């Protein structure tokens, strides 16, 4: 019978998939912690063999008909295996698309804007221009860097994106999707049971629904940031207008977290930085990860494996091998869980260690699942379950419990307000940017935006959604989204929006599980085994169940809810309402200086 044939097919597939995936992941680890040409080519052949085996098995898996499969776990495994992806095109179109993607990657990694009248002062984005966006306060130098990287990337990436959209539309319509936007929204499709059914076309309106009520908090934050930047820039910013695009602390305005020195509420009150306390007690990276492990065993999740401590790198090696500075949590397979992080003894790397060990605990919990179901419930769950550990690790209760912060520490309201404002600049300020970028990409892939009216649409919506105006008018020879890393390298962006929603949903559910009686941003889930079990019911699922079922297992709801997000930022929202009485909350769409 067909279902038993599919069961034996999955049993045959799982063992070779696990072996080849382990070989590919080990070669990728050996390249990422030891950069050389032989490790690069070994990674190339390992990924080539694993990808060739995966497509060879997916062509055979497409022969099964899902109309006669009753057990939903086998059906979900065959759904995961039948995703052909970019292989649905012919070899010529796939090679052309890979050529476009590779030239986009090597032109973003080698993007170049250089100083006018100073031809020797040529700056790349990654070492030097991000420093200008993060630190510099001069209006004209930021206008230079923004408009110059917009010119020398958008002018070079506009036709590349022109055929990129067409090739991705052909690839998506070869996989029975309406557009490439629907292909990305198929990551949120859930088919299991009744009442847990989620559709791709539902997702957009859910996102719009969740943007219906983040909008007052974002409007108050935008008004406060606009007033403080008007204090910084006297005549270049209008009270009723939008913010200029190059004054937002990032290259694209994606994160407002670099505006915190300009927009600090209480400058006399210091921050909750405990780096010097780590310096005084002689902490190292081993103690950082041991304290993260102590947190995860106090909440009830299991200990770290011996192979985790044996095989991972937790320090710059300094023995002649080049490494990647970005922290990454690796699930190599066969019970191998590693973390690559060049941990300095700072508070940010302490929170990052908690974040990546949250990733590793999420990976460890669904190891009992079959190989095709060893993923997150969707793309937002995996990063949300690390962000909640970063949330609980930064609280003054957790820092006072582990001796990093003194026992007689006073938590007045002013440090809670400015901590919540720094968190809002990181968290709330990225939500209209994420929603507007994904809405622009969805309407471009749908064809709802005409091809010759791209740029004129985008700067409308950044005036409408984000409330951020262009500094200089751009015509259609620019490609201003494509200057961002995620869109020039073919990455879905709505995972950050859903991450932000699911993060505070999970945090409120765990804090109600841990029976916390205070405000949500002070909440710690340490020494609470019942919150750990409430979490681990979802972590053990993987994507074996629909993500609505896992979401109901944590929070008791089957959809995205931003009432936890507004409940997290409630003291800051009350403070922002209290200091926006005289001012004008909101922005006007026409260009005001």
């Amino acid at each position: 019978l067909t279902e038993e044939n599919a069961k034996t097919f999955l049993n045959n597939f799982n063992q070779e998939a696990e072996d080849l995936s382990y070989q590919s992941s080990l070669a990728s680890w050996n390249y990422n912690t030891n950069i050389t040409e032989e490790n690069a080519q070994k990674m190339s052949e390992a990924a080539a063999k694993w990808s060739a085996f995966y497509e060879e098995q997916s062509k055979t898996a497409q022969s099964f008909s899902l109309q006669e499969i009753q057990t939903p776990i086998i059906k979900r495994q065959l759904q995961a295996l039948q995703q052909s992806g970019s292989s649905a095109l012919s070899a010529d179109k796939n090679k052309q698309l890979n050529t476009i993607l590779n030239t986009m990657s090597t032109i973003y990694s080698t993007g170049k804007v250089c100083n006018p009248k100073n031809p020797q002062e040529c700056l790349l984005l990654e070492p030097g221009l991000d420093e200008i966006m993060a630190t510099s306060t001069d209006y004209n130098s930021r206008l230079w860097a923004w408009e110059g990287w917009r010119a020398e990337v958008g002018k070079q990436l506009r036709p590349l994106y022109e055929e990129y959209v067409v090739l991705k539309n052909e690839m998506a319509r070869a996989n029975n999707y309406n557009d490439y936007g629907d292909y990305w929204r198929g990551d949120y499709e859930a088919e299991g049971a009744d009442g847990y059914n989620y559709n791709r076309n539902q997702l957009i309106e859910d996102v719009e629904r969740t943007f219906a009520e983040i909008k007052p908090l974002y409007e108050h934050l935008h008004a406060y940031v606009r007033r403080k930047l008007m204090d910084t820039y006297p005549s270049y910013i209008s009270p009723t207008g939008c913010l200029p695009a190059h004054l937002l602390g990032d290259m694209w305005g994606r994160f407002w977290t670099n505006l915190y020195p300009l927009t600090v509420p209480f400058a006399q009150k210091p921050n909750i930085d405990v780096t010097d306390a780590m310096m005084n007690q002689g902490w190292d990276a081993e103690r950082i990860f041991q304290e993260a492990e102590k947190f995860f065993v106090s909440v009830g999740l299991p200990h770290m494996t011996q192979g985790f401590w044996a095989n991972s790198m937790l320090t710059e090696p300094a023995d002649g091998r080049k490494v990647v500075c970005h922290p990454t949590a690796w699930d190599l397979g066969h019970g191998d869980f590693r973390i690559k992080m060049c941990t300095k003894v700072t508070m940010d790397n302490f929170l990052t260690a908690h974040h990546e060990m949250g990733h590793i605990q999420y990976d460890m919990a669904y190891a009992r699942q079959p190989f095709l179901l060893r993923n997150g419930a969707n793309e937002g769950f995996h990063e949300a379950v690390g962000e909640i550990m970063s949330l609980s690790a930064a609280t003054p209760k957790h820092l006072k419990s582990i001796g990093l912060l003194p026992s007689d520490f006073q938590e007045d309201s002013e440090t809670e307000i400015n901590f919540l404002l720094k968190q809002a600049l990181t968290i709330v300020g990225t939500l209209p940017f994420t929603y507007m970028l994904e809405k622009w990409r969805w309407m471009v892939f749908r064809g709802e935006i005409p091809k010759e009216q791209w740029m004129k649409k985008w700067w409308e919506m950044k005036r409408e959604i984000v409330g951020v105006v262009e500094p200089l008018p751009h015509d259609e020879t620019y490609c201003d989204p494509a200057s961002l890393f995620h869109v020039s390298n073919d990455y879905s962006f709505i995972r950050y929006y859903t991450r932000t929603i699911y993060q505070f949903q999970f945090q409120e559910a765990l804090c109600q599980a841990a029976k916390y009686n205070g405000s949500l941003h002070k909440c710690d889930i340490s020494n609470s085994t019942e919150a750990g079990q409430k979490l681990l019911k979802m972590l053990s699922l993987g994507n074996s169940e629909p993500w609505t079922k896992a979401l109901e297992n944590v929070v008791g709801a089957r959809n995205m809810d931003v009432k936890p997000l507004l409940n997290y930022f409630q003291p800051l929202f009350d403070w922002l309402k209290e200091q926006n009485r005289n001012s004008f909350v909101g922005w006007n769409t026409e260009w005001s200086p």
Binding site: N5, T8, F9, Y22, S63, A310, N311, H334, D336
Partner: protein, 201 residues
């Protein structure tokens, strides 16, 4: 009387090469004095689980024949080497009967059976038409015919090679690291019982 002639447990337990679980090695043991305090006194032998007889009274209660079955499995499949269990190893590789009288011994063997390139010399049976009878082996390499079309000796779709490799590597998690298992099965027959442990003076 002063004793000699101990049973060759050094040949079974301290062997340089074990066997795959599908072709599990069986050695019969008779006409010697079997002392089992060698196995209990070694701390690397982590799992020492005995069925039907106590581990403490192994040296005094004595038997006619002792079968030592040696093989290699992974760590989380050691629990399948027990009466009444199910799994791949129990159904298709090594089955113990429900009235099994004996002991199972297992220990980690990373330093002997794990290779960085991968040890592809340990195999197990993943597909078989019917479950194994107790103390039965299957060394057949016939292609498993899971569908309706005849396989005709060539693998592919609905035609799988049944012996799949335990690709052991030293960086695996503890449930997948190689574990060497020796199953001691004790039997009494109408023959005079000639495997008996030591006595004192």
């Amino acid at each position: 009387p002063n004793i000699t002639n101990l049973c060759p447990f050094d040949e079974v337990f301290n062997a340089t090469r074990f066997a795959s679980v599908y072709a599990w090695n069986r050695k019969r043991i008779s006409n010697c004095v079997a002392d089992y305090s060698v196995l209990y006194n070694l701390a690397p032998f982590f799992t020492f689980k005995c069925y039907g007889v106590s581990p403490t009274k192994l040296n005094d209660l004595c038997f006619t024949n002792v079968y030592a079955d040696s093989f290699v499995i992974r760590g989380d499949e050691v629990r399948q080497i027990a009466p009444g269990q199910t799994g791949n190893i129990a159904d298709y590789n090594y089955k113990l009967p429900d009235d099994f009288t004996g002991c199972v011994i297992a220990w980690n063997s990373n330093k002997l059976d794990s290779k960085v390139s991968g040890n592809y010399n340990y195999l197990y049976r993943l597909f078989r038409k019917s479950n194994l009878k107790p103390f039965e082996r299957d060394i057949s390499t016939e292609i498993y015919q899971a569908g309706n079309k005849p396989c005709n000796g060539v693998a592919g779709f609905n035609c799988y090679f049944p012996l799949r490799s335990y690709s052991f590597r030293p960086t695996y998690g503890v449930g997948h690291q190689p574990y060497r298992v020796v199953v001691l099965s004790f039997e009494l027959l109408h023959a005079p019982a000639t495997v008996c442990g030591p006595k004192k003076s």
